[PDB]
Amino acid sequence: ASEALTMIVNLLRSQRPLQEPTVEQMRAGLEAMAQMSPLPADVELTTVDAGGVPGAWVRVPESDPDRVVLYLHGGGYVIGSIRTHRDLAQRIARAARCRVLLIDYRLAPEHPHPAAVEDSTRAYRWLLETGSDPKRMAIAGDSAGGGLTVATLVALRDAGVPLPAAAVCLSPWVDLEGIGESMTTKAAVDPMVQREPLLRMASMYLAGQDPRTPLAAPLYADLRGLPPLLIQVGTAETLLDDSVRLAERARAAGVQVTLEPWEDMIHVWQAFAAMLPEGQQAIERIGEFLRQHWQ
Ligand SMILES: COc1ccc2cc([C@@H](C)C(=O)O)ccc2c1
Numbered sequence: 001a002s003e004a005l006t007m008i009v010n011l012l013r014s015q016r017p018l019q020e021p022t023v024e025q026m027r028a029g030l031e032a033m034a035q036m037s038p039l040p041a042d043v044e045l046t047t048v049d050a051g052g053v054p055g056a057w058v059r060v061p062e063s064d065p066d067r068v069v070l071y072l073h074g075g076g077y078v079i080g081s082i083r084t085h086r087d088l089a090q091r092i093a094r095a096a097r098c099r100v101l102l103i104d105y106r107l108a109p110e111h112p113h114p115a116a117v118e119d120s121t122r123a124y125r126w127l128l129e130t131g132s133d134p135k136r137m138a139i140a141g142d143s144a145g146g147g148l149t150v151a152t153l154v155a156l157r158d159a160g161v162p163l164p165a166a167a168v169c170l171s172p173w174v175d176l177e178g179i180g181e182s183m184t185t186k187a188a189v190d191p192m193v194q195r196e197p198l199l200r201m202a203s204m205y206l207a208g209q210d211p212r213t214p215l216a217a218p219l220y221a222d223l224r225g226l227p228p229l230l231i232q233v234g235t236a237e238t239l240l241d242d243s244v245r246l247a248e249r250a251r252a253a254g255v256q257v258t259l260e261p262w263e264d265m266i267h268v269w270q271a272f273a274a275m276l277p278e279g280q281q282a283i284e285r286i287g288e289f290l291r292q293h294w295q
Contacts (some may be wrong), residue, residue: 001154001263001278002276002277002278004275004277005119005265005266005269005276005278007275008152008266008272008275008276009191009266010018011033012191012192012198012266013191014211015029015033015092015236016029016069016158016192016195017029017030017033017079018194018201018283019194019197023078023079023109023204024243026078026079027078027079027081027263027282029082029277030075030079030080030084031082031083031084031105031254033067033079034083034084034085034086034087034186035079035083037186037271039086039087039090039266040060040090041059041137042057042058042060042062043058043059043060043086043090044057044059044091044197045057045058045086045136046059048052048101050101050122050127051104051122051123051125051126051129052126053072053099053103053104053105053119053122053123053126053186054082054103054104055082055101055102055103055123056081056082056101056102056106056153057084057099057100057101057102058071058086058089058090058093058099058100058101059093059099059101060090060093061095061266062092062094062097063093063098063099064098064099064136064239064241065099065134066132066133066136066174066243066290067096067098067099067137068098068099068100068101068127068132068136068137068138068289069096069098069101069122069137069138069168069172069278069290070086070091070103070120070123070137070138070139070140070147070152071088071089071092071099071100071101071102071103071140071141071145072103072105072139072140072141072148072149072152072233073085073102073105073121073141073142073145073147074141074142074143074144074145074146074170074171074173075107075143075144075145076143076173076197076201076202076204076205077107077108077113077116077144077146077148077201077202077205078107078108078144078199078201078205079107080107080144081104082102082104085092085102085104085142085145087271087274088142088268088270088271088273088283089102089233089237090286091270091280091283092140092271092283092286094141094287094293095096095128095283095284095286095288095290096109096138096286096287097291098118098138098285098290098294101123101127103119103120103123103226104147105115105119105120105123106118106119107288108201108204109204109205109208109257112204112205112206112207113206113207113208113209113213113215113216114215116144116148116151116205116218117148117152117155117215118150119153120149120152120246121152121155121156121159121161124137124139124152124156124161124164124236125156128161128162131230131259132167134149134162134163134164134225135164135294136165136168136294137164137165138165138167138290138293138294139152139164139168139170140167140169140187140286141168141169141170141253142170142171142172142266142268142270142271143170143171143172143193143239144172144173144201144205144238144269145170146169146170146171146172146173146174146231147169147172147173147174147218148171149167149168149172150167150172150174150218150223150226150229151214151215151216151218151221152170152222153226153227154214154218154221154222154223154226155169157214157225157226162226163226163227164227165227165228165261165293166227166228166229166230166289166290166293166294167226167227167228167229167230168229168230168232168233168250168286168289168290169229169230169231169243169246170232170233170268170269170270170282170286171233171234171237171239171242171243171267172239172243172246173198173239173242174217174218174219174242174243174245174271175212175217175242175245176198176200176202176205176211176212176216176217176218177199177212177217178198178199178202178238179239180238180239180241180242180244180245181241182237182238182240182241182244183195183238183239183241186235186236186237186238186240187238189236190236190237190238190262190266190267191266192216192240192267193237193238193239193242193267195238196214218246219242219245219246219249223249223250223253223255224249224253224254224255225253225254226253226255227255227256227258227293228256228258228293229250229255229256229257229258230258230260230285230286230289231243231247231258232258232262232270232282232285232286233259233260233261233262233265234258234262234264234265234266234267234269235261235262235263235264235265236264236265236266237245237266239267243259243261244259246258258289260282262272263286264276265282269282270283270286
């Protein structure tokens with residue numbers, strides 16, 4: 001891996017937003033870290049009411065105005081915001097030459113499951129209502145937002161809503177019990193995600209519901225009929241086996257899955273693309289994948 005990976009690992013070993021003592025401090029910690037990646041001058045942000053869900057349009061100069069990624073931010077269903085993820089959103093908008101709708105879906109513990117999935121499906125339905133075409137759309141998300149991407153597709157399919165051309169999952173979180181082998185075997189090399197904080201956030205999202213509830217933990221969902229899926233994951237991740245098991249389940253369901261394991265990469269390494277070469281390389285691959293499925 002690039003020497004820059006050592007700098008990102010060192011940052012994460014000291015700035016541990018998932019290990020902050022309160023939800024308020026976890027939220028503020030991730031906001032402080034995102035504020036470091038300064039936004040390019042050519043990014044246009046437009047706040048919008050996406051059918052009752054607050055959102056922001058992210059546009060860059062080469063955004064095709066009729067192609068849209070609905071972007072579902074990570075943060076364990078508890079943290080993250082339009083602010084934390086607008087840099088990753090603009091990088092994807094640039095690579096995929098599209099507009100990104102970044103939504104502020106309801107967060108736990110204030111709004112437990114299924115609030116997040118109600119909001120992601122409402123935003124997608126609103127895009128259709130306002131004239132977006134499914135063959136020029138995609139849903140993408142990181143970590144909890146990667147799990148929410150799969151759950152959103154399942155819920156839309158079950159409601160008879162036309163599915164988009166493709167979907168992208170970045171280090172998705174789909175096992176809310178943390179029982180993947182890598183949760184043990186990669187614990188020593190993951191500077192961000194460990195079982196204790198994952199179970200803390202799962203508790204807030206589930207509010208006593210079965211941790212294998214399919215739209216909360218899509219490792220247990222019926223995935224038949226989903227569109228082509230790109231799963232990017234790092235091998236230095238306790239969540240590696242979330243991606244491996246999701247790929248197995250989607251392939252068994254007849255889905256066109258690409259599983260891309262990036263050697264030595266850490267959780268949502270794409271968010272560090274300003275400093276990490278593999279982050280920008282992975283975002284270029286996301287853009288290639290989306291443009292191929294919109295052809
Ligand atoms: C430098 O900027 C960032 C921005 C968002 C980030 C999000 C995560 C995790 C919690 C995520 O939402 O998947 C990690 C690092 C991040 C760094």
